[PDB]
From Swiss-Prot:
It is found in: Lysosome membrane. It catalyses: a beta-D-glucosyl-(1<->1')-N-acylsphing-4-enine + H2O = an N-acylsphing-4-enine + D-glucose; a beta-D-galactosyl-(1<->1')-N-acylsphing-4-enine + H2O = an N-acylsphing-4-enine + D-galactose; cholesteryl 3-beta-D-glucoside + H2O = cholesterol + D-glucose; a beta-D-glucosyl-(1<->1')-N-acylsphing-4-enine + cholesterol = cholesteryl 3-beta-D-glucoside + an N-acylsphing-4-enine. GO terms for biological process: autophagy; cellular response to tumor necrosis factor; ceramide biosynthetic process; cholesterol metabolic process; glucosylceramide catabolic process; lipid glycosylation; lysosomal protein catabolic process; lysosome organization. Glucosylceramidase that catalyzes, within the lysosomal compartment, the hydrolysis of glucosylceramides/GlcCers (such as beta-D-glucosyl-(1<->1')-N-acylsphing-4-enine) into free ceramides (such as N-acylsphing-4-enine) and glucose. Plays a central role in the degradation of complex lipids and the turnover of cellular membranes. Through the production of ceramides, participates in the PKC-activated salvage pathway of ceramide formation. Catalyzes the glucosylation of cholesterol, through a transglucosylation reaction where glucose is transferred from GlcCer to cholesterol. Belongs to the glycosyl hydrolase 30 family. Disulfide bonds join 6-18, 20-25. Glycans are attached at residues 21, 56, 143, 267, 459. GO terms for molecular function: galactosylceramidase activity; glucosylceramidase activity; glucosyltransferase activity; scavenger receptor binding; steryl-beta-glucosidase activity. Its EC number is 3.2.1.45, 2.4.1.-, 3.2.1.-, 3.2.1.46. The active site is at 232 (proton donor), 337 (nucleophile). Pathway: Steroid metabolism; cholesterol metabolism; Sphingolipid metabolism. Keywords: Cholesterol metabolism, Disulfide bond, Glycoprotein, Glycosidase, Glycosyltransferase, Hydrolase, Lipid metabolism, Lysosome, Membrane, Signal, Sphingolipid metabolism, Steroid metabolism, Sterol metabolism, Transferase. This is Lysosomal acid glucosylceramidase.
Amino acid sequence: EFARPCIPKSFGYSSVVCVCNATYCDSFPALGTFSRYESTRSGRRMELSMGPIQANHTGTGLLLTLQPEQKFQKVKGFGGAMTDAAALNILALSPPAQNLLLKSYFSEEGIGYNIIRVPMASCDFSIRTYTYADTPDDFQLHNFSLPEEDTKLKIPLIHRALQLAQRPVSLLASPWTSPTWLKTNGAVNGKGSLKGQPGDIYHQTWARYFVKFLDAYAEHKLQFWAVTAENEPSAGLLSGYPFQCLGFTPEHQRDFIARDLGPTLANSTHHNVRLLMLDDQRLLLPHWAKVVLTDPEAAKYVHGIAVHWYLDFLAPAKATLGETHRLFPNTMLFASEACVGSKFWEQSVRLGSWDRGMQYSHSIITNLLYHVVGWTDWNLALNPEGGPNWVRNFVDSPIIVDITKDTFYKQPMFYHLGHFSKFIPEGSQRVGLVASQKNDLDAVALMHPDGSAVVVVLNRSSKDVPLTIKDPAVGFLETISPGYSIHTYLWHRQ
Ligand SMILES: *[C@@H]1O[C@H](CO)[C@@H](O[C@@H]2O[C@H](CO)[C@@H](O[C@@H]3O[C@H](CO)[C@@H](O)[C@H](O)[C@@H]3O)[C@H](O)[C@H]2NC(C)=O)[C@H](O[C@@H]2O[C@@H](C)[C@@H](O)[C@@H](O)[C@@H]2O)[C@H]1NC(C)=O
Ligand SMILES: *[C@H]1[C@H](O)[C@H](O)[C@@H](O)[C@H](O)[C@H]1O
């Protein structure tokens, strides 16, 4: 289509949102030039410009030098979660407005997401508590079934998303709680775990539940890339935990995967589905990786390690991600859940917040710089309150839906995310990037599967920083990174 620009609107915070409705939504180099996409606090939204690649460079300004031969992880991708709350919000819009929201995310005219996390039954971003097997003591799982949250809300929206998408989309599933008749405390929330011990009928049934969920989704012609072994297993170890959870120590998780979940999936028609362990705060690394992955019976089933961002302030990426990679380089690290406005003192939704967009890109760049292969936002959309949410655990979302007005707002988080998701396709590989002097920039460089280069530069300071990027193959890009800007640079080195 033609590029339609952002309709900006201010809500009194540091930047603007882009206004989208039933009929309007904003949407989207020759050798040897580069493309630059820029977003700024002042209001630019992924604006395209071009520049020449020079042969020479002189000066003592900041130089960032690509090391195309230092090769690191391959990227799996970027996306968000299709919760009950996200489905209810999107379906609240008229169908044309719904198409423009899905296109914003999934289409090539939008920012190209290729990952969708799907909860297995209810979480806090549900308006009802339920599992797929609520009939008590149904150990055979005869009464297992998907309710309308799945069959009328989530499943059809995931289908629209795959139809709009240019890139292959990977589905990732995670459970919050099991049926309560499987749990020590008999409740969806609170402190409690599976009854018994791995290897027994409870653990066997819980592993069969995963296969039943996959069978059920496959009947609706949806197939999964990966499942996690539990969302935030540490939560269910905490007294009074307020919403759906299921606690595992790392030993409990090791032995569940070894004796029940890994063999159950390996013996099912879904043996190709990857299993991710942890799915919890990175400060749990490297300890959890060492407990699970040094048992060869558990390690043979574990494809990767899922991390969440909520305690990153306590957990230096080098001592957590870097050290895990050093010990277990062949087990991919993947960021599976992030959102702002989740601390009890923070405002849930701050329409137009630039700070919250910068938190997203700063996290993404730091994760890429420490071997992480992908990054998943939480709810795809929320209402202006940051809900619905059965326990009022409201948070922020890159897209806020205003149903009484059939309109949605794209926040700075949406664009900060798009500066990566749009321009780093599955298969791209991170390469070296070194700075000539101390600076306030955050930057990462990658190579696309066709060998072209992509560099994202975030300026977290208020000062404009002139800089040059050196590609030792090709030449020099002379540029400036304005204070509170994010830029993505692209060029063919072919
Ligand atoms: C969906 O969102 C679009 C984009 O904002 C709305 O269309 C826009 O309406 C604007 C104001 O209503 C128009 O801009 C104005 O231009 C006029 C003269 O041309 C000036 O008097 C004024 O100062 C404004 O700047 C503009 O035509 C249009 N914007 C774009 C870029 O398309 C739209 O509103 C619905 O259609 C438009 C064309 C208006 O006439 C509305 O009143 C109309 O109901 C939004 N749709 C809905 C349902 O609100
Ligand atoms: C991750 C975060 O705690 C988020 O706020 C919460 O809503 C999810 O349920 C949890 O898994």
